[PDB]
């Protein structure tokens, strides 16, 4: 059973998706991938209408259009230390919830005079109240205790203040979750000094870009942090820090950990808890034993060698 | 050769204590500096800072500013906003270097973040289009972008620095950040003695937290500078140990502490002047008193590696004055 749309994407995306199906076939996972080698191609919206979930690589711009044609307004990134992989900050566990459809990401730019460029940054009560209720629903669904709202409302009094205001309003409906606000630049500095004061963070688009990759590098980097993007009907699974030179360099060198890890999140979403717990734990255990590690984690292993070992452990029965 | 007058703004809270501690450390090394205390707290006549404060900073170009208390009034503007527009402070410079006594997870850090201070998302332009729809305007111009990229390659050559990195998000804001990059490259080709490259804000953020050693001088637009500079602060110890200067027009510069006013320890002899000291060291170098600065700097660093006297916030029981006098002792080598 279970059809899932797969967009392999730009860069090493095709090689991670190859790892995903390889571990999936290994763990004998009941999921058939209906894949489109994109890059209208609104065939994607049709397949998601029937399938309702996707796994995607790295792709207004297409990315921010496809997001908009899917209303993928909420982005979730799980910053969680993996036991075997050691970093300056260990035993960390954060959720970065990010608005995706507004801000500076809609190409609203123009020239008002020669050499004077204006670029618009859009905040609306609609999209902010929505991402704010989503963050608090995430805190309640998952047992998190605090939601910190990150902004720069002291400079952008309107607008960043609109976003702030909706957060405080939404926050009264959830009196069982603690709610704090912090200023983006202060937040970034606390994130390196002491990231353990944070539980769930919620921010608009551009700040979310920054804090996605900053937290990602706290616990291991672009190769191990996974992320989802949700609609109200749709669930798209990707990697957490999806910045421009994230894993694009190299062939057979990339880390499949983040893609596998969110692939196992996708399985949890599909209600396949058995295969989610298996693949996740396989991945996590190959990292802990420290036998094979990819170059970004300090080892010498090829992407194929790392994936091979994940399969050898999903298939093992003495575990 | 000659004695100079620096406008000194002591500020609030631990302000006067750290100010008066820096005056004492300058005295100790017989540094050619007179001080002229002014007050920058804003008034509004026919919004502005007191006339005596303007005439002071205009006559003697240098200032040294301690922490100001955040105003209470809603309508009261940001004090740094009034300071910036009065003297056209366009380059905010933040050298972030690990301190040898103060152990941090990051040990090899030596970064300078030059930050465009005039425009960007701090344009101050916002509109309510319709109900519940706001619009903040980010502004990038070719003049300002060029000015900052010139400063950064200057700073890089003057302070014998080897690489400059233009940090942008031109992949997203293709026209605004694109223009910024365009002029950075333009300046970079007329100063081919410095290895220049570009990175994305998010690539720098993800790399900074993993390995700060690879970075050097970083030049970027306003918002990106604000975030990145505090981020790099946390790499070395926080706002309490980081210098800061704002270079402006007519030779004007104000060097500042970025840390808090800290009133709970006001009066008690417990504040830390390291931040305000290292900013006044910047001031000395910006004025060309290079040996007085390299000396004062060497003392303060030596005091912190000893450990004998550290304030409450670096792991010591030593008072603000026990710390200060140790430096003054040390600076008479």
Numbering used by the authors:
A (entry chain C): 14 to 52, 62 to 81, 92 to 351
B (entry chain B): 2 to 47, 51 to 337
Provide the authors' own sentences about this structure as they appear in the paper.
Human NAD-IDH is a key enzyme in the TCA cycle, which catalyzes the oxidative decarboxylation of ICT into α-KG. Our previous biochemical studies demonstrated that the αγ heterodimer alone exhibits a high enzymatic activity and kinetic properties comparable with those of the holoenzyme and can be activated by CIT and ADP but inhibited by NADH; on the other hand, the αβ heterodimer alone exhibits a low activity and cannot be activated by the activators but can be inhibited by NADH. Our structural comparisons show that the αβ heterodimer has a similar yet more compact overall structure compared with the αγ heterodimer and contains a pseudo-allosteric site that exhibits substantial conformational differences from the allosteric site in the αγ heterodimer.
Crystals of the αβ heterodimer with the α subunit in apo form (αβ) grew at condition I and belong to space group C2, and the structure was determined at 3.06 Å resolution with each asymmetric unit containing eight αβ molecules, which form four dimers of heterodimers via the clasp domains. In the αβ and αCaβ structures, most residues of the two subunits are well-defined except the β2-α2 loop (residues 52–60) and the β3-α3 loop (residues 80–93) of the β subunit and a few residues at the N and C termini of the α and β subunits. In the αβ structure, the key residues at the pseudo-allosteric site, the heterodimer interface, and the active site assume similar conformations and form hydrogen-bonding interactions comparable with those in the αCaβ structure, indicating that the αβ structure also exhibits an active overall conformation (data not shown). Similarly, in the αβ structure, Asp-230A, Asp-234A, and Asp-217B assume positions comparable with those in the αCaβ structure and are not in proper positions or conformations to bind the metal ion effectively. Structural analyses suggest that the active overall conformation of the αβ and αCaβ structures could be attributed to the changes of some residues at the pseudo-allosteric site and a unique hydrogen-bonding network, which stabilize the side chain of Tyr-137B and the β5B-β6B loop in the active conformations and further trigger the conformational changes of the heterodimer interface and the active site.
